[PDB]
């Protein structure tokens, strides 16, 4: 289960970080080079099978990574993300035992690589299923292995946010930014070359007279992006940073020093749910991967419990889909909080052993009553911390003020926690 | 204020680029007639007539010009004073700005030679 | 079978008040500073705009 495949599968690993340990800004150089790569990585593929729909999970799928039928971004970091998540599951859930020898953590990274590359191969096979099928597979793995190396050289390396989450964040910055300035529009019944940019809604004032019907197309534009959409997008950003500052303060007499009070906080977003939203995303990505195996042996009847109902009309033609979608969103993020905290740290025993491990004792009571001091916060500030993100992303969909939705709310939440992490070392 | 300088350098490539060809607007780049086989490959900057441009020609020219000037701004505003990090940040600044200066002038020299057919 | 619902709904209204609810100062700092940090990651899309579609014209045209 672990003792056999892991010792053989060691083929082509990564090089661990050097002895140039403490530095400020060459850290940021190792970030920026990867950001040059994902300038470059979102670029066009070499095969001319020009299929009509771009991707089938293109919208939710697009929210996670937006190079749908596009570049070497490979339709998602969904290999590394899904393969990381179920790995940490099956380490934390004791279906498979825990490895804490350094050989076992190294081969744990090896098996991480294994499931990641196998899932890349799975996505490759499932998107390509003509006679031109050569060398696509070679390209994808080469560009799967590259994202692998760039992520694991930004965990043991620079890594502060992750490799992963800041990729998602910057690509979400771009997906707002193509909506920010928009050069082309294929010409409709009138009005070429203006699609939901503010330049579009400044060139539109230069072309057309009757500025009332220049305002109306600027603020109630439907098929292209909208500027009412952009107001709602800004509005969501403001509210979500209103809710990041929700934090619980706990003051701490440090042990053996008179009265320094570096109060440990607990923010509600609670790792900003980069598990828990991607928990909400990638299960609904893996079936819309595997509906391709449903074509043989669908986008219709399976969709009614699969997706949002996509309609600005709140009383659109099915309340079943709306109710089940919202209830699944809320329950999914709450449930994956109350299951998530037990593995990636900051559960009750986690916090207790970190604070004893860094000599910080609550004033009110004895050291190992700190558990019962804070066990009445962390699950609820998991669960509510799950819950009122997903309902928050309901407000990211219910009102279309989001450039990309849920995912953009949450990748900028990644950025907001990210700023704290960078600031920490000042 | 210096925002007026920002306004002017904003206006710079804006009226170097295409205000002249706002009303005389000529669409971006396609002019090949199969050349022997392949029909409508978009060509280039215009070359045969000198005064004309397209939208894609002008924007590129404007971009080349303001980056060079603001590279000299960066030479003035930070590289001559001595206050910040005296071995790491400064060396980056002279490095990328000298790269800006040299490769910019080189490529604009190329983008007058190849549309222009001038003896170099 | 009904009471854990009561437990969690009262449990929420506990920890909403215990949180500190930031005011016009820290909100201001992370607000402006992190929209700035956003646009640090942001204009990068305008530079794949300025680059990777015209070089895709170079790609398809040749």
């Amino acid at each position: 289960f672990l003792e056999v495949i892991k010792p053989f599968c060691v083929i082509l690993p990564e090089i661990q970080k050097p002895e140039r340990k403490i530095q400020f800004k060459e850290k940021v150089l190792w970030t920026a080079i990867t950001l040059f790569i994902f300038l470059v990585c979102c670029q066009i593929p070499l095969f001319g099978i020009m299929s009509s729909d771009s991707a089938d999970p293109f919208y939710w799928m697009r929210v996670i990574l937006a190079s749908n039928r596009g570049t070497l971004m490979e339709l998602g970091i969904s290999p590394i993300v899904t393969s990381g998540l179920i790995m940490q599951l099956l380490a934390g859930a004791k279906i498979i035992e825990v490895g804490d020898t350094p050989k076992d953590r190294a081969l744990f990274n090896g098996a991480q690589k294994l499931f990641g590359m196998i899932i890349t191969i799975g996505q490759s096979i499932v998107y390509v299923m003509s006679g031109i099928c050569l060398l696509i597979t070679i390209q994808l793995f080469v560009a799967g292995l590259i994202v692998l190396l760039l992520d694991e050289l930004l965990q043991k390396g620079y890594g502060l946010g992750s490799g992963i989450s800041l990729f998602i964040a910057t690509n979400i910055c771009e997906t707002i930014v193509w909506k920010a300035f928009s050069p082309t529009t294929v010409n409709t019944g009138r009005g070429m070359e203006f699609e939901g940019a503010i330049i579009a809604l400044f060139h539109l004032l230069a072309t057309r007279t009757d500025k009332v019907r220049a305002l109306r197309e600027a603020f109630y534009r439907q098929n292209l992006p909208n500027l009412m959409n952009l107001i709602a997008t800004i509005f969501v950003f403001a509210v979500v940073i209103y809710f990041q500052g929700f934090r619980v303060d706990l003051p701490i007499k440090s042990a053996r020093y008179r009265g320094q009070y570096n109060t440990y906080p607990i923010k509600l977003f609670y790792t900003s749910n980069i598990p828990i939203i991607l928990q909400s995303a990638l299960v609904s990505n893996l079936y819309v991967i595997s509906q391709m195996l449903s074509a043989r042996f669908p986008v219709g009847g399976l969709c009614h419990y699969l997706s949002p109902p996509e309609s600005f009309g709140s009383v659109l033609e099915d309340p079943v889909h709306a109710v089940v979608y919202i209830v699944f969103m809320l329950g999914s993020c709450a449930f994956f909080s109350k299951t998530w905290i037990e593995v990636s740290g900051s559960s009750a025993k986690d916090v207790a052993k970190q604070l004893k491990e860094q000599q910080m004792v609550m004033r009110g009571h004895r050291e190992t009553s700190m558990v019962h001091e804070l066990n009445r916060y962390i699950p609820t500030a998991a669960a509510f911390g799950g819950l009122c993100i997903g309902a928050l992303s309901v407000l990211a969909d219910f009102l279309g003020a989001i450039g990309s939705g849920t995912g953009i709310l949450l990748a900028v939440t990644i950025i907001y926690q990210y700023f704290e992490i960078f600031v920490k070392e000042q | 204020a210096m925002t007026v300088y920002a306004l002017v350098v904003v206006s710079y490539f804006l009226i170097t680029g295409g205000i002249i060809y706002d009303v005389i607007v000529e669409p971006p780049s396609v002019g090949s007639m199969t050349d022997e086989h392949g029909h409508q490959r978009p060509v280039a900057f215009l070359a045969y007539r000198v005064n004309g441009q397209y939208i894609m020609e002008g924007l590129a020219s404007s971009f080349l010009f303001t980056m060079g000037g603001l590279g000299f701004i960066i030479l003035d505003r930070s590289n001559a004073p001595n206050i910040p990090k005296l071995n790491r940040f400064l060396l980056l600044f002279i490095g990328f700005v000298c790269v800006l200066l040299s490769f910019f002038m080189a490529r604009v020299f190329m983008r007058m030679k190849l549309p222009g057919y001038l003896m170099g | 079978f009904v009471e854990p619902s009561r437990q969690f709904v009262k449990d929420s209204i506990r920890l909403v008040k215990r949180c500190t609810k930031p005011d016009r100062k820290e909100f201001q700092k992370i607000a402006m500073a992190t929209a700035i940090g956003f646009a640090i990651m942001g204009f990068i899309g305008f530079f794949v705009k300025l680059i990777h579609i015209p070089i895709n014209n170079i790609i398809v045209g040749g």
């Binding site: 050097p18 066009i44 080469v142 190396l149 | 086989h37 490959r41 | 790609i59």
Partner: peptide
Amino acid sequence: VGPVPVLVMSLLFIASVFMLHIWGKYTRS
């Protein structure tokens, strides 16, 4: 990255894509 070749390796991969993209397109038009 004790070494910088992993980056260089990525650059090589893009070049392989970059050059090999137009390399087959050489014989076409």
